[PDB]
Amino acid sequence: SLQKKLKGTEDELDKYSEALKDAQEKLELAEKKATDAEADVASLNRRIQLVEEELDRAQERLATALQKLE
Amino acid sequence: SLQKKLKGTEDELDKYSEALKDAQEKLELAEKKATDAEADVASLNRRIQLVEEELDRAQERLATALQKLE
Amino acid sequence: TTALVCDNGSGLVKAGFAGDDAPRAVFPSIVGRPRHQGVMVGMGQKDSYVGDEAQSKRGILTLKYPIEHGIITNWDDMEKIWHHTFYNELRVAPEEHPTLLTEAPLNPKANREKMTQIMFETFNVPAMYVAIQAVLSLYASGRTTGIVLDSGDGVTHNVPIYEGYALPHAIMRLDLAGRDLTDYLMKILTERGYSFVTTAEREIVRDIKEKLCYVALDFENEMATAASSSSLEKSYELPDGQVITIGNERFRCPETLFQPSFIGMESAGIHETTYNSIMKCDIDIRKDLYANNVLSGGTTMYPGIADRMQKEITALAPSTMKIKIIAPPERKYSVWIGGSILASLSTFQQMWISKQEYDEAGPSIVHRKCF
C-alpha cells in the first residue's frame, strides 16, 4: 500500500531537484546579464555627461559667432 | 521499520520543497532586476545616440557660423 | 473640520482625505453581478459586488463600467460605488466632510448637475466642488505655466495654461485612451492564436498590457528588427498556467496613440494634437508651453513614451525652440495629489458650494460664479 506512495514521493523529489538545478542555472544567467547591463549603463552614463558639455560649449560658441557676424 | 524511512523521506521532501520555493523567489527577483536594468540601458542608449547626433549638428552649425563670420 | 478629496476618474477610483500625500484607497470602478444560479442554500450572498471585492470573484461575475468616456452612463452603479467608497473603504460619514470631485473638460452639463444633485441629496454633504483634471495636475507638478497632457482610461485631453490663465479655445479632447488600447490588444492577440472575449478576461488582457507593453522610438525599424531577431519575445503566465508568448504585439498596441488609424479613428496622434494645441495659443507664450510640457495619467506610464513624444515634437517644432517633457514617477496619482494640495488652501475655503446656497440657487448653481 505504502510502496506506491513512496515511489511517487521519490519521483516528485527527483523532479523538484531537477527544477532546483534549472532554477540555479537560470539565476546565474540572469545575474551575469544584470552585471553586464550595469557595467554598460555605467560607461554610458559617465560618457553622456561629456557629450552634453561638449554640445553646450559648441552651441555657446555658435551663439557668440552669430552675434559677432551680426 | 518502514515508518522511519517514510518520515525521513517526508522531511527531506519538505526541506527540498522549501529550498525550491526560495530558489524560485530569488529567480523572479533577479529576472525583474535584469529586465529593469535592460530597459533603462536601452532607453539611455537611445538618449545617448540622439545627444551625440545633436552634438554633431551643433558642431557643423558652429563651423558654418565661423566661416560666415570670417 | 477636514476636507475629503475624491476622484471618480474612469476605471480606477482613488479617494482620501485632503492634505495627505497619496490616496488612501485605490480600487477599480467595477460593479459585478452573478450570471449563474447557485445551488448552495443558506450561503446568503449579496446581489451585487462592487470595487476590488468583485475582482476576487471574477470567474462567476460579469463586469460593467458605469463610466464610458468621462461621462457616467449608469447612475445606480455610480451611487453604489460612491457609497462603497464613503463607507467600506474610508469608514467616514459624509455628513461633515466637504467633497471635492473631479471632472474632465468638454463634458455635458447634465453630468455635473446630476453629480451635484446626488452628492447633496443622497449623501447630504455639507459642501462640495467640481474641478478640472488638468488644472489639478498642474497644481501637483509644481508649475504655473505649460501645456499639460492627461491620458487616463476614458479620455485624453490637452489644456494649455500660461501664468495661471487658461485658454479654453485651445483645449483639445480625444476619446482615445487605455480602454481602446486594451480592445486593440484583444483584436491583435487573435492573430497569434489567443482569443479573449469574456469580460473577465478583459482584466487579463489589461494586466498583460500594463506589465509587458512598451513604446518603440521607431516603428518601422522595430518592425524590421523583430521580423528577424527573436529577442523581443516575452512570456506571460495566465491565472491557470498555459504560458503564452507575444512578439510584435508588444509595441504595436501603444502605437495606436500615435497612429489612431489602426483602430479606424480619423483623428491624429497625441504628438500632433499637442503641437496643434500649442499653435492654437498666442505667439508670445509658446516658449513656456514648449519648455513645460507636462504628462500625467495612467496611459502615460508606458516606458519610452516621453522619448518618442519629445522626438516627434522636436520634428514638428522649430529647431531653435528647446523641447522639454516632465514625466514624474508618480504620474498616475498626479491629479489626486493636486486635489489634496488645492483642498488644503486657505483661500479655497470660500469657494465651496454651501447647502443653503445650493438650495436657493437650484441644481444649476455649478456653472454660476462658484464653479
Ligand SMILES: Nc1ncnc2c1ncn2[C@@H]1O[C@H](COP(=O)(O)OP(=O)(O)O)[C@@H](O)[C@H]1O
Ligand atoms: N504601469 C502601467 N503601465 C501601463 N498602463 C497603465 C499602468 N498603470 C495604469 N495603466 C493604465 O491606466 C489606466 C488607469 O488610468 P487612471 O489613472 O484611472 O485614469 P483616470 O484617473 O482618468 O480614470 C488603466 O486602464 C491602465 O490600463
Ligand SMILES: [Mg+2]
Ligand atoms: Mg485621470
